[PDB]
């Protein structure tokens, strides 16, 4: 970096005309996701130092107060793209420290308190094929039928945990039935709204 435009590039703004608000897919969600921190610790009065992969942790949530790092390596504002090995965090302006959220995966779903709670209970539309059954499906405790025409069960059919076990025992390995989402929301995930729109 010639440093003749780095500060110049630091100050910028957009028009933001005709802004839209809508959902997305997890790709951009992890595109925002950058770091990985482990601990819930707030601050250590033992050394008055930031938590290591904790809250307000280094190698996470953006730069450090100075261009100096928490470990101490590559401590200069002149160092722009060099990443110290001791703790990997971008050494730059603290403004980006406000402009860095994270993404938390934990690899599994649960209840969305988005539907059936607001003045409009989108539940039915939100759960689509489940139709206000996504909340019940948020328990991984039914493993309802996913597919299976050989078994006398619809693909989008409710098979509670006991119902799932009975189907697996009776229909053998023909009555496919999965959970997470458990009651109906997985079959919602395996559904097409075009037929539902035509039927409605």
């Amino acid at each position: 970096k010639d440093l003749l435009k780095f500060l110049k590039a630091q100050t910028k703004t957009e028009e933001f005309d005709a802004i839209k608000i809508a959902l997305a897919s997890p790709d951009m969600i992890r595109s925002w996701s950058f770091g990985e921190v482990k601990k819930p610790e707030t601050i250590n009065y033992r050394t008055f130092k930031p938590e290591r992969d904790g809250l307000f942790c280094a190698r996470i949530f953006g730069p450090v107060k100075d261009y100096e790092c928490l470990c101490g390596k590559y401590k200069r504002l002149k160092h722009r793209g060099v990443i110290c090995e001791k703790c990997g965090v971008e050494v730059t302006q603290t403004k980006v420290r406000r402009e860095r959220m994270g993404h938390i995966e934990l690899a599994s779903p649960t209840a969305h308190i988005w539907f059936l709670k607001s003045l409009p209970s989108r539940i039915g539309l939100l759960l689509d094929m489940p139709l206000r059954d996504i909340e019940r499906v948020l328990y991984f405790e039914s493993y309802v039928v996913i597919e299976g025409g050989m078994t006398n069960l619809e693909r989008q059919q409710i098979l509670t945990e006991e119902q799932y076990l009975d189907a697996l025992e009776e229909f053998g390995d023909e009555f496919d039935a999965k959970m997470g989402a458990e009651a109906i929301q997985a079959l919602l995930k395996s559904m097409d709204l075009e037929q539902e729109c035509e039927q409605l």
């Binding site: 839209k20 959902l23 997305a24």
Partner: protein, 49 residues
């Protein structure tokens, strides 16, 4: 100008001292922070034109 985010305070002071008397629309700096939100940018259909 009239509040809290001293971030463009430096720009305002520099412009006034230069007699520039100029400001940049930018973003509600706090709505730029609300984008920082955006369900963690989860809602960014923002079609900035």
């Amino acid at each position: 100008v009239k509040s809290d985010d001293v971030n463009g305070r430096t720009k305002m002071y520099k412009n006034i001292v230069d007699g520039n008397h100029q400001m940049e629309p930018g973003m509600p700096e706090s709505f730029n922070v609300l984008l920082k939100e955006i369900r963690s940018l989860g809602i960014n259909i923002e079609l900035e034109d």
